[PDB]
Design a protein around this ligand. Sequence first.
Ligand SMILES: Cc1cc2nc3c(=O)[nH]c(=O)nc-3n(C[C@H](O)[C@H](O)[C@H](O)COP(=O)(O)OP(=O)(O)OC[C@H]3O[C@@H](n4cnc5c(N)ncnc54)[C@H](O)[C@@H]3O)c2cc1C
Ligand SMILES: *[C@@H]1O[C@H](CO)[C@@H](O[C@@H]2O[C@H](CO)[C@@H](O[C@H]3O[C@H](CO)[C@@H](O)[C@H](O)[C@@H]3O)[C@H](O)[C@H]2NC(C)=O)[C@H](O)[C@H]1NC(C)=O
Ligand SMILES: *[C@@H]1O[C@H](CO)[C@@H](O[C@@H]2O[C@H](CO)[C@@H](O)[C@H](O)[C@H]2NC(C)=O)[C@H](O[C@@H]2O[C@@H](C)[C@@H](O)[C@@H](O)[C@@H]2O)[C@H]1NC(C)=O
Ligand SMILES: *[C@@H]1O[C@H](CO)[C@@H](O)[C@H](O)[C@H]1NC(C)=O
Ligand SMILES: N#C[C@H](O)c1ccccc1
Ligand SMILES: N#C[C@H](O)c1ccccc1
Ligand SMILES: O=Cc1ccccc1
Length: 521
Amino acid sequence: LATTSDHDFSYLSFAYDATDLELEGSYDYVIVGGGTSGCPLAATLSEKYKVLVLERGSLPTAYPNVLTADGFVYNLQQEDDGKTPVERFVSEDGIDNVRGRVLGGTSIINAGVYARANTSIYSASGVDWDMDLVNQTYEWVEDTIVYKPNSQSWQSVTKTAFLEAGVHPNHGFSLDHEEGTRITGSTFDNKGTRHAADELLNKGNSNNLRVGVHASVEKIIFSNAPGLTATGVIYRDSNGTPHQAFVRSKGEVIVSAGTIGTPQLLLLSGVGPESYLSSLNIPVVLSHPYVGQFLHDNPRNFINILPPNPIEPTIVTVLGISNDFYQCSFSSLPFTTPPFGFFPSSSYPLPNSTFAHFASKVAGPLSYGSLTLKSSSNVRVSPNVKFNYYSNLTDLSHCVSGMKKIGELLSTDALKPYKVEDLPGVEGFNILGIPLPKDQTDDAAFETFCRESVASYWHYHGGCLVGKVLDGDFRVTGINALRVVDGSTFPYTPASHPQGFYLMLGRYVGIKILQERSASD
Ligand SMILES: Cc1cc2nc3c(=O)[nH]c(=O)nc-3n(C[C@H](O)[C@H](O)[C@H](O)COP(=O)(O)OP(=O)(O)OC[C@H]3O[C@@H](n4cnc5c(N)ncnc54)[C@H](O)[C@@H]3O)c2cc1C
Ligand SMILES: *[C@@H]1O[C@H](CO)[C@@H](O[C@@H]2O[C@H](CO)[C@@H](O[C@H]3O[C@H](CO)[C@@H](O)[C@H](O)[C@@H]3O)[C@H](O)[C@H]2NC(C)=O)[C@H](O)[C@H]1NC(C)=O
Ligand SMILES: *[C@@H]1O[C@H](CO)[C@@H](O[C@@H]2O[C@H](CO)[C@@H](O)[C@H](O)[C@H]2NC(C)=O)[C@H](O[C@@H]2O[C@@H](C)[C@@H](O)[C@@H](O)[C@@H]2O)[C@H]1NC(C)=O
Ligand SMILES: *[C@@H]1O[C@H](CO)[C@@H](O)[C@H](O)[C@H]1NC(C)=O
Ligand SMILES: N#C[C@H](O)c1ccccc1
Ligand SMILES: N#C[C@H](O)c1ccccc1
Ligand SMILES: O=Cc1ccccc1
């Protein structure tokens, strides 16, 4: 783990605005998306080769509130002017959501919860994992931006509630995703300073790594030398001037534009379903039926309580893990401006006092949808995405069990002091929004609750799966010098909170590439 310190912006020495980058550059590797996986990947590759990372968003310094824990809600509340770090979108299901648009990616605007992936998921994932390397990489990330949190009153209350409610065993402080209750790590340090993926750029070689911000990558360039190969990308700066960045022999273009951005860029570049691309007059580079398919978004269901006695805002650190659902509680100050994506719609009552948000994330999820373009030419126009929440009934069953567990928490001695009236069961609380069914044994009522109150846990992933679009080495099948490394590569969430795994993934693949270049050297 790391030690509390200011956000490290040393990498600014090699950060440039796209308008200042050359019109035509040559590198060993070009990384699209300076996000959660993108930054550590770029830093690792720069240890030996010339790397250029292209990020559409601004430097974190352009939006100071992304650098503190008490700025979390603020960023979500900010109006989307097309340049802000929080990009708003609404799935076809009608659920509000957001994604990062800034150097550091979504790790720069998230809730800071850090967890290592469930150790049992690597086995039949389609990737032959080097577990020694996986752990060395987690350590590499953790020693740079992960911290053991301060004790916090509300989180402690939540911990007592989980333990009283049978979420066992107790793991004390642990980073591992395991069944039971525990206090995990956070990317927010003990002074509330947010640390993120961008700082992993500092681990790279300052003479080999170059970062371009305000760089909108619109298309991947291909050629046959002699086989189909990615040769670079076209990106545009704030002046509307297009640039080109090419990769040299043995080099590669790696797309780390995220669950939403990666499939979008591939489609715009002619890599996707042939009939679909043709319907939009997009030249087909390679028919790839699964690009944009298998998009998953774990549903979030919750209960907001308004204690009669004020509680203090806290960062989530206490996790109550079950096999089918993951839970936690977020305490916060009241708002009069809605944080987009926090509640499912803009028409949700706002809290005028301090409140606690008990959240439940369904594992998986088994349900999935797809991503389609909204513009056949403009990469700045958000793609259409549908997740089909609860289309798979097993997900619904898990939501029911999960909300019943929340009901248990609400019925504990631990939460009694936060009720307005001493009533039986889950009754007695001042609830903001949709309350739980009073009868904890009414499954049908819980199913309706699950469906009508659903929101996004913001941990969407998939869209460019290993075994569907990519091979075990994250290469886009059928195309040379092209890989994908970010949250779009797997169908299910790796843990209650995925940033740890995606951060690790970036460097992991980076190391695999260096090992590959060593053997072929
Ligand atoms: C509100 C919120 C709270 C969250 N809280 C937590 C939490 O507490 N703990 C946790 O573990 N996880 C959390 N997550 C999820 C986690 O942050 C994400 O799963 C993770 O950051 C995704 O990593 P990524 O590398 O795939 O994508 P991203 O980090 O999003 O990175 C993709 C990058 O590509 C850029 N990009 C996209 N298209 C282009 C293009 N065409 N050209 C150039 N650049 C482009 C984007 O701007 C972005 O910087 C949260 C997510 C949200 C939205
Ligand atoms: C990669 O890291 C894994 C953790 O992220 C690690 O698994 C953990 O390994 C430790 C021992 O190194 C196990 O032991 C701990 O827990 C047991 C049971 O509770 C205690 O008896 C021990 O005293 C100790 O506290 C962990 O249980 C285990 N955790 C998990 C979730 O599996 C892997 O072994 C590492 N892999 C490699 C190849 O290094
Ligand atoms: C909901 O997700 C389940 C797990 O992915 C699906 O079941 C699985 O379906 C596989 C076929 O794609 C099959 O090989 C697995 O054995 C099976 N596993 C389980 C838990 O049964 C389920 O699909 C439906 O049920 C299975 C059993 C088959 O009959 C499928 O044809 C059904 O579609 C998913 N349900 C939905 C709504 O898709
Ligand atoms: C860990 O992953 C395995 C394999 O996918 C799964 O069976 C198990 O339920 C998961 N455990 C938890 C607590 O999520
Ligand atoms: N469990 C436990 C430890 O006391 C603990 C560890 C980290 C932060 C708060 C508290
Ligand atoms: N189970 C499961 C997920 O698909 C998964 C996620 C990351 C790595 C391996 C597997
Ligand atoms: O899982 C973390 C979290 C944080 C704030 C609101 C909901 C969930």
